[PDB]
Amino acid sequence: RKPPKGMFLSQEDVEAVSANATAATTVLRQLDMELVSVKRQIQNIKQTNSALKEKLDGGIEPYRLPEVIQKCNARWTTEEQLLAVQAIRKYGRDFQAISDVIGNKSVVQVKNFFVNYRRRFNIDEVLQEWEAE
């Protein structure tokens, strides 16, 4: 059998509330102390977070850059070949970043680029440099 519903009586707890004289008021005060100590610690983190909240006021709206609606393309302008080599130097293998920088190349076209021009732009060496930081 179990206790009535919403009545809690663990073996362990019975022992603990009876064990000594006033173990009742002892255990019940430990929790009154514990509660107020958690209630105060709530106020700290509330007030701490209220300050951190206020710093972010404004969001990042003054720092937002408009949308570049760029159409993908097969051809590689000598321009964007050079943008690539430099992007490789700064980003290494983050083909997404390299694609975003160049603007008009899909992420696969970037991966292909690595392979086609690999020899002509010493792309090995270029990566060794990026890795070296």
Partner 1 sequence: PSGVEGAAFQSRLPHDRMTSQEAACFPDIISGPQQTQKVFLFIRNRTLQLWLDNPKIQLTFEATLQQLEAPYNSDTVLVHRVHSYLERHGLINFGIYKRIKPLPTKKTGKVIIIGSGVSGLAAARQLQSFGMDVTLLEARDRVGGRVATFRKGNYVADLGAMVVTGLGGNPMAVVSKQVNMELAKIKQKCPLYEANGQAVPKEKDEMVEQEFNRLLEATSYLSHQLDFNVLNNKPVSLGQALEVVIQLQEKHVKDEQIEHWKKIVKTQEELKELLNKMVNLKEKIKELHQQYKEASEVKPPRDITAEFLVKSKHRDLTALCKEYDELAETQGKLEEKLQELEANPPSDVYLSSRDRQILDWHFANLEFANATPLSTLSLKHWDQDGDFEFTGSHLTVRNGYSCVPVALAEGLDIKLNTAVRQVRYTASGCEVIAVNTRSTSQTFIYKCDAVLCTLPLGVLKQQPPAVQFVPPLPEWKTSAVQRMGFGNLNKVVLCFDRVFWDPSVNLFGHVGSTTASRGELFLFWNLYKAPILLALVAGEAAGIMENISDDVIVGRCLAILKGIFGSSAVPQPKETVVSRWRADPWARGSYSYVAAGSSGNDYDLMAQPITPGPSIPGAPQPIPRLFFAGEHTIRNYPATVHGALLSGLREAGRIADQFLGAMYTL
Rule CB under 8 A: which residues touch partner 1?
1-4, 6-9, 11, 13-14, 17-18, 24, 27-28, 31-32, 34-35, 38-39, 41-42, 45-46, 48-49, 52-53, 55-56, 59-60, 62-65, 68, 79, 82-83, 86-87, 90, 97, 100-103
Shortest separation between residue 75's beta carbon and partner 1, angstroms:
17
4 or 131: CB nearest partner 1: 4
Shortest separation between residue 18's beta carbon and partner 1, angstroms:
6
27 or 108: CB nearest partner 1: 27
Name residue, tokens 């392979």: 115
DSSP 22: T
Shortest separation between residue 100's beta carbon and partner 1, angstroms:
4
Q: In angstroms, what CA-CA distances link 8 with 13, 99, 116, 130?
A: 9, 62, 73, 63
In sign, the C-alpha dihedral spanning 85, 92, 65, 103 is: positive
CA distance 22 to 97: 68
Shortest separation between residue 133's beta carbon and partner 1, angstroms:
15
